[PDB]
Structures are given as structure tokens and as C-alpha cells.
Amino acid sequence: PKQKTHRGLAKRVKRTGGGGLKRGRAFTSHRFHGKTKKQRRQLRKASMVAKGDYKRIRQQLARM
Amino acid sequence: PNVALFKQDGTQNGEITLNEEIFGIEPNESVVYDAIIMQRASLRQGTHAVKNRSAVRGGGRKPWRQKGTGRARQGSIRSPQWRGGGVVFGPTPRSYSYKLPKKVRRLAMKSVLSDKVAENNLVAVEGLSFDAPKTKEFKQVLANLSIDTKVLVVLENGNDFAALSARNLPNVSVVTSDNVSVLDVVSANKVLATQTALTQIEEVLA
Amino acid sequence: MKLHLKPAEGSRQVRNRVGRGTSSGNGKTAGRGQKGQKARSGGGVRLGFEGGQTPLFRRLPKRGFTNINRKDYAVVNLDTLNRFEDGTEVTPVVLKEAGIVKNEKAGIKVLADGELTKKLTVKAAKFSKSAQEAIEAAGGSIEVI
Amino acid sequence: AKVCYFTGRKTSSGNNRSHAMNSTKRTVKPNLQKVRVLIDGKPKKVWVSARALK
RNA sequence: GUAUAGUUGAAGGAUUUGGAAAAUUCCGCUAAAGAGGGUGAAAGCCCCGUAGACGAAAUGCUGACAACACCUAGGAGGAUCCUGAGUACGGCGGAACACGAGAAAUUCCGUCGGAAUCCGCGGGGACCAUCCCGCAAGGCUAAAUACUCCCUAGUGACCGA
RNA sequence: GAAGAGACGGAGCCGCAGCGAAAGCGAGUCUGAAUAGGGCGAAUGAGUAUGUAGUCGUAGACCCGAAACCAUGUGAUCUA
């Protein structure tokens, strides 16, 4: 039978055109009065793939 | 592509010219190799099977205890280390067939037929006719053309008085103009064929 | 080449059979080493498991939605047109009909990369704001039908 | 209470959820009443649902 | 026409080693039959067969086409009448839909309420309006699909105690 | 079509264009007041079909081994 892709990563990660993946940062949906104002600016913007976690995840997101 | 013509014994009328798209194209060798293996490996029946532990007509209780007896521990009578037990990883029914793309098949056909042209093994007969199916006369036909080895006869349509005279020695196997495969040709040494069979080959093979 | 055969060079490998004696290199535990659940029968954890550490997908947040009525097109840029020399009515038929646009998706859009020197005519369903200028520079005619 | 004589009501079974969705098995039974009716003029006693007494 | 008994069906001798030849050496013959099995060892020409050709008293099956059963009419008008009831649908509690009450349409089940009649009624994923597509609460229906206890005839880079 | 090679069959699938959650725009786009800066793209940058081999996933998945669990049945000739 076919593989089944993960439905936790399809709702969190979208694939770019160069090969990598776009990722949305964390620590954004909670208390903010603890955090500073440089932090809450610099945690709006998306980051890329670290090549450690691209190994074990690659086969799950086989087509999406 | 210039092949002479024979009557039944009369010799060398005008030599038939053939399409250089087909009969002159310098055969690839790996294509013919994989065509032969794909053909001959597609002839298998796959019917063979072996029972295992859940299919051996046995029982499902520990005969012993785990302790007290002092012998090693067993779960059931029938399991692969016993005699009469099941078998681990036996052969199961498969099908072994697979189809190449639709360019290499015609590349194989063209390559084989150009190979047999370049070594002068097509002997084109102007036309074969028997009033009755007499296998002795067909032997005399092959004696007139002086061919001895494993040979092919390619026929046209219902030549029922020329196809009913080929249950000969194994020099001869006979295919009509439609069922010409690869293994029917590569196994043989020479090919006899009529004029019209060449034309109906050049319709399908363009 | 007849029945009594050669493969291509490098065309077919052999195999590697595992658990057959201590001088092939894979006898006594079969390339698995000593104990542990990567070395039992059928062991190994599921994919993406990292111990009880919360894995990467339960660490970064869910985001977005999908439109139900997304209508995206079947883009041809501009150089693909540059072999239909003069006067064709480029269209969602005869334009395709040689191996150019199989499977138009919602109608054909045209883009502007990168040089057209003809006098064609185009019938598509959308156009960029530079492809019209590139076509009318070369003297053609366009219509969004 | 086994069946109806006129309709097709009979006892059956279904689940039972309770406030944190734990399921067991019920016995959902129809309301039935022993009613003296006139079957071909001769009176009998038979089980009839109250639904057919409207 | 076919199924269950069948008929007929071409062509070889001698020598050497042998316990015994189909083996070997000379010279022949056949083929619409050179698939297979058996014979004192390995056979186109010894036997049983095969290709071809022919054949059914009795019972069953399948086509066919006769007979006999059945079934099936047009155009216009639109005053009045008919078109499936404790049914549709709603509340409550459960189930079935990929859908776990969820913003939850559509299908059933238990109980309690409970409509309209063509100027009508349902549906288009809560709901309303507009548009579009359809007439529930009465029945029947071949083939394409899944299986093999058993029968006949075959095959296998399936096993050989 | 001989359980076959062997032709028809162009529904479909993959590559040729990306960015954005999206409306959309397009060799460019997103955030932004910004023609600023930045992310991700493009600037020759080749895929696809089949065979074979290494690894992984779903299936018992390299085999042997429990204590226990659930559903039908069989027993009071021993013993209470």
C-alpha cells in the first residue's frame, strides 16, 4: 500500500522551490509581558531548515 | 538491402530492395539483450506455494510447562525447528512480467532484422504454393534453396496448403506475418519469407 | 548476438546475502551489532520519534488556511510562442497539439520571458502587464477571450 | 413486551455515553401495552404500541 | 448443434558389443502424424497413441423459428376532482455517513409533540432571500461482479519420502 | 492474441515559474508609509520510463521463548 504523509507537518510547513522548507517560529502565542521588544519583533519572521532535522523528517513529507 | 529472388528452383530475378529505415540501422546490443530476457522471463507460470506455521494442520497448545521439566521451552508442536513444522519464508505465487517502453520494442525488431540482412540470411522466395499438404515436397523446396540449419518460414495469411507442411525436423518453425516476436527470430540462423510477407511486415513496422 | 549473451557493463549487480559465516563480513548479527531495540526482530521506533522530547512538529505552531476557490493558471512564458512564425490564432487548441500545453488548468495565462520577434496573435484568458507591451511592440494583436 | 402486532417495533440495543465519553451497552425498548382488540371479530389480547393508539 | 460408450488411422532391415538393444556401423522409407507413455538399456518406422476422418438406440442441455399466451394509440380544452398520514418535520437520547456535537446539512432508531395539496412540496453541508434542479411517505427487474465440496481435459525455471 | 511480444487505448501522472495564510501579482513577489532594507526566487543551470542494487514504511517482517486477556464449548464416575 501507499505511504501516508504526516498530518501534523502539512499544517505547519510549506515547501519552497529551492528545495528547503519554510518554518514558522515559536514563542508567539502566549504571555508577552515577560518578553522584550526586540524578541517580539524578531519572532514574526520565518526561518529555514536546519540540516539535522531534514534527515529524519524527509520521508514523512514525501510529497507535500 | 538487396536480396535475390528464387522461384521454387529458378534463380535470381530482380533483387528486392528494402526500407533502410528498417533493414539497415546498425543494431544496438543491450536493447536486444534486455528484449530477450524480458521475453523469456515473461513465460513463467508463478504457481508454487509453501505452508507456514498458521497453515500447517496442527495444534495450538504448549505441550509442556515453562518450568519443572528441565528441558528447553516450547510453544507449539509445529514451528520451523521441528520436523513436520512450517517453513519460514517459502516461495509464494508471483507473476514475473514487466513491459518496456514502446520505443525499445520496435528498436529491437529493427535491430534484429538489420542484423540478419547484413549477414545474408534472408532468402526471399517469390511465392510458395502447394496443391496439397505434402511435407516431402517442402523438404525438397528447402533442398532446392540449399538451406540446412535452423530456419524460419514467414507466411502471409491462410496458406493452408503451405502451413500444413511444417511439422518437419526441428530445422523449421513457422510464424505468420502477425506473430513475429523476437525469440522466434534470434534463435534461428536463416529466414525464408515470401514477397507479400515482407510487405505486410513493412506496413506494421512502417 | 545469439542465444549462447552479454549484459552492458555495470548493468546488473549481484546481491549481498546476510548471516552466512564470519568471513563475508555480515555473519553473527547481520550488520546490527550488539543488543538494543534496533537489533531485535521488527524493532526500531516510528518515524520522527525523538524519545520523550517533544518533537519538532509539536513545538512550532499551526498556520494558515486553504481557499476553496483557488483558480490558478497554466503558464506559458513567451519564448514558447516564438516558433509559430506569422499568423496562427494561438488558442487553447492548436497551440497545444504538438506537445506544448497538455492539461490546461483554468485557462492559459501568458508571461513575459524573454524575447519575441514575430507578428503573432493570441487568445488566452489572462495576460501580464508586460506581455501585452512585448507583443504589441512586435506588432501582433491580443484579446482576452 | 416482545413485538407489535400492527407496527414493527421490537427491542434493540445502543450505547450509553456519560460526560467523558465512556460507552456501555443499553437495552432500548419500545413502549408496549397489552390491549384487547378485535381481530376478525373475535377479541384477543395482544401487545400494541401506544404510538398506534393515537 | 452438444454432453455421456467408440471406429479407423502412414512408414526398417542386416552387422558389432551384449544376458537382453531402441545403443553403434551401412543402406532405406514416412510425415495434415517428430506431443507423450510402454517394451529384457536411450525407438519417427514394435505396442498404446497423436494429425486427419467418421459415428449415437437412450436420457439431458443450448441455440433457432413456428404456434399459443401477453403488453402497447393521436390532437385540443382546463370550471370541478385525484396524485401514497399519525407520514413529512421539530424537541429530547443514541447510532450510520471519512465527519468523535462540532458552525453540523443528508440517513435510521426509541419516546413525546405534529403539517400542506400544484398560488403545493423537497434539495443545492447551520440560516434567510433570489435563482436552478427535482416529486418522497407503494412493489418487480437480466448482464457486466465474488467463491469451488465435486466432474472432465490440461499446465508449472512446483516437492521427490 | 498460445495463461505468450504486441499492436490499439492520451482519461491521467512528472518536469518546464515563483512568491504570499489569502484575495492576487508574475522573473518577480511578501512585510512595509517607503522607488529604503530584509526573506525566498530567477541570471546556461534537464527531466522522464523501465531494469538492477543499497536503505526505510505498511504488512507476523531475521526466527525461537513467557506470566497473563477475551469468546464459544466439555466435566460432580474423583471430591464438597
Side-chain angles (χ1 to χ4, degrees):
Chain A
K2 295 178 182 180
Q3 284 181 350
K4 293 187 177 182
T5 67
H6 196 197
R7 285 296 175 94
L9 288 170
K11 301 176 183 179
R12 289 175 173 89
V13 170
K14 290 182 175 67
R15 178 172 287 167
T16 69
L21 298 169
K22 281 179 68 69
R23 293 173 180 176
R25 284 178 177 263
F27 293 108
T28 60
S29 65
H30 269 281
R31 61 186 77 185
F32 283 97
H33 52 82
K35 302 170 189 174
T36 65
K37 294 179 181 181
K38 284 185 180 179
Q39 292 177 356
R40 66 188 70 186
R41 288 179 186 173
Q42 291 173 353
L43 301 182
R44 293 180 187 174
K45 297 181 179 181
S47 70
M48 285 296 292
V49 171
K51 284 187 179 179
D53 287 329
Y54 194 73
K55 291 180 184 176
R56 74 165 69 90
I57 291 174
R58 181 186 294 170
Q59 193 179 3
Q60 287 181 354
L61 293 170
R63 286 183 181 176
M64 296 303 291
Chain B
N2 292 318
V3 178
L5 281 177
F6 295 141
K7 311 292 288 295
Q8 299 291 108
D9 51 351
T11 303
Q12 285 175 355
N13 289 324
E15 296 177 355
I16 291 176
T17 64
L18 297 175
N19 282 322
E20 289 82 2
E21 296 181 356
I22 297 171
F23 297 94
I25 51 95
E26 286 190 355
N28 287 322
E29 299 296 329
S30 64
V31 180
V32 179
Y33 173 80
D34 195 80
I36 291 174
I37 289 177
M38 187 273 289
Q39 184 171 2
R40 190 172 59 81
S42 63
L43 289 173
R44 297 199 183 188
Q45 293 186 0
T47 70
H48 54 280
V50 164
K51 291 190 178 183
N52 57 358
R53 299 184 64 237
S54 63
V56 176
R57 193 176 191 273
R61 174 56 64 89
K62 287 178 66 68
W64 301 347
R65 284 191 288 112
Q66 186 69 39
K67 288 184 179 177
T69 61
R71 189 61 180 170
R73 59 267 181 102
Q74 296 304 117
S76 67
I77 306 165
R78 287 171 175 172
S79 70
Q81 61 190 0
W82 294 76
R83 74 183 289 272
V87 182
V88 288
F89 306 127
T92 58
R94 295 184 286 126
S95 295
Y96 297 99
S97 70
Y98 64 99
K99 291 183 181 181
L100 287 176
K102 279 186 178 179
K103 291 184 181 181
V104 296
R105 298 174 72 92
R106 288 189 180 180
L107 183 62
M109 295 288 284
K110 292 180 181 180
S111 64
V112 169
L113 294 172
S114 178
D115 194 4
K116 285 191 180 298
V117 167
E119 290 176 350
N120 293 318
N121 299 321
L122 281 173
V123 179
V125 181
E126 294 191 358
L128 294 175
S129 179
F130 297 107
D131 296 332
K134 191 65 67 179
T135 62
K136 181 179 183 293
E137 299 178 357
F138 186 75
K139 179 182 178 181
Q140 187 56 254
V141 171
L142 271 77
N144 290 316
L145 301 175
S146 70
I147 301 171
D148 294 333
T149 65
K150 181 184 285 292
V151 79
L152 280 180
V153 176
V154 177
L155 294 175
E156 315 170 357
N157 282 319
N159 288 321
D160 296 332
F161 297 103
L164 267 293
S165 294
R167 280 80 181 270
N168 213 170
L169 295 172
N171 291 317
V172 171
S173 62
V174 161
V175 180
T176 71
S177 66
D178 292 333
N179 283 316
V180 176
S181 67
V182 182
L183 281 179
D184 289 334
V185 183
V186 182
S187 66
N189 285 319
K190 288 183 179 180
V191 174
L192 288 177
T194 64
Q195 294 182 359
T196 69
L198 290 174
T199 65
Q200 292 191 359
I201 285 171
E202 283 182 349
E203 293 182 358
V204 175
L205 288 174
Chain C
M1 185 175 180
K2 60 181 71 64
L3 268 289
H4 62 273
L5 295 174
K6 292 293 291 182
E9 62 175 0
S11 174
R12 193 173 293 270
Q13 288 80 11
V14 185
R15 274 187 78 175
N16 280 317
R17 304 178 70 249
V18 184
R20 302 288 165 172
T22 69
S23 69
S24 68
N26 291 320
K28 188 189 175 184
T29 64
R32 302 165 79 95
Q34 289 305 114
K35 301 173 185 178
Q37 70 173 357
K38 293 194 183 75
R40 294 288 187 266
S41 174
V45 299
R46 69 179 186 268
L47 287 171
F49 183 75
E50 300 183 5
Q53 192 182 12
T54 62
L56 190 60
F57 82 102
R58 292 175 62 84
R59 197 181 302 167
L60 50 83
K62 191 189 293 185
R63 184 173 185 175
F65 78 103
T66 301
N67 189 6
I68 189 166
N69 296 321
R70 179 169 172 83
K71 183 254 289 182
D72 55 352
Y73 298 109
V75 50
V76 47
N77 283 319
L78 186 138
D79 291 331
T80 308
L81 294 178
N82 199 359
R83 53 187 174 90
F84 285 169
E85 62 276 14
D86 275 320
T88 52
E89 278 189 353
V90 179
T91 177
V93 283
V94 183
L95 166 67
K96 51 171 185 177
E97 284 191 356
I100 290 94
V101 181
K102 299 187 284 290
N103 190 9
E104 65 171 0
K105 294 178 98 291
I108 300 172
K109 189 174 184 180
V110 178
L111 291 183
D113 192 2
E115 286 184 355
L116 189 146
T117 61
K118 296 295 180 66
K119 199 183 265 78
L120 305 177
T121 173
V122 183
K123 184 184 289 186
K126 199 67 64 65
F127 289 93
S128 75
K129 204 174 87 273
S130 297
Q132 286 184 355
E133 298 182 357
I135 290 170
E136 293 169 351
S141 66
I142 48 96
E143 55 181 359
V144 184
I145 298 169
Chain D
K2 54 180 289 184
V3 291
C4 284
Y5 189 76
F6 300 99
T7 57
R9 272 75 184 273
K10 67 187 289 185
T11 169
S12 64
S13 66
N15 292 324
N16 199 168
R17 297 289 178 89
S18 64
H19 191 72
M21 305 298 289
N22 295 317
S23 63
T24 61
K25 298 289 185 178
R26 283 180 58 87
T27 57
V28 174
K29 292 190 284 184
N31 202 165
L32 285 171
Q33 294 293 111
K34 283 176 95 286
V35 185
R36 178 177 292 116
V37 302
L38 299 177
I39 300 168
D40 292 331
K42 296 195 287 184
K44 295 291 288 183
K45 294 180 76 70
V46 72
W47 298 93
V48 180
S49 294
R51 187 71 174 171
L53 293 177
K54 287 181 179 289

